[PDB]
Design a protein around this ligand. Structure first.
Ligand code: BEF
Length: 124
């Protein structure tokens, strides 16, 4: 049941290949973007069930990426790979409905782990 669209924003390629096929086997649609602002463009026409954002490119490292998401999507939850920058912006995330902040590690094991158990807690 349910579609299941998981969007990721990071270095792509490596992160994409793993999360794309592997997460696809789980029954979801995993796509990746450059870092964050890219998903925003796509977000302007769609909303993923579990968004994943990077944090090492934009102004506020990555938390800034959250701000963009909350500006147009004050509900779409996002998952950041790092929280070493201005954590302040991460707060605007929790208020808009962000997912959380995961350490640099991720891959399928660490990401799929946080995604499945997370969506399961939400349910329809
Ligand atoms: F690689 Be991301 F900037 F955490």
């Amino acid at each position: 049941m349910q579609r299941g669209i998981v969007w990721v924003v990071d270095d792509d390629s490596s992160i994409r290949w793993v999360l794309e096929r592997a997460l696809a086997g789980a029954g979801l649609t995993c796509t990746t973007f450059e870092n964050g602002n890219e998903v925003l463009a796509a977000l302007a026409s769609k909303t993923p069930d579990v968004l994943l954002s990077d944090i090492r490119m934009p102004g506020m490292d990555g938390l800034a990426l959250l701000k963009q998401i909350k500006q147009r999507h004050p509900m779409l939850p996002v998952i950041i790979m790092t929280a070493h920058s201005d954590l302040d912006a991460a707060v605007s995330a929790y208020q808009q409905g962000a997912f959380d902040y995961l350490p640099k590690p991720f891959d399928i094991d660490e990401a799929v782990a946080l995604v499945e158990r997370a969506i399961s807690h939400y349910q329809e």
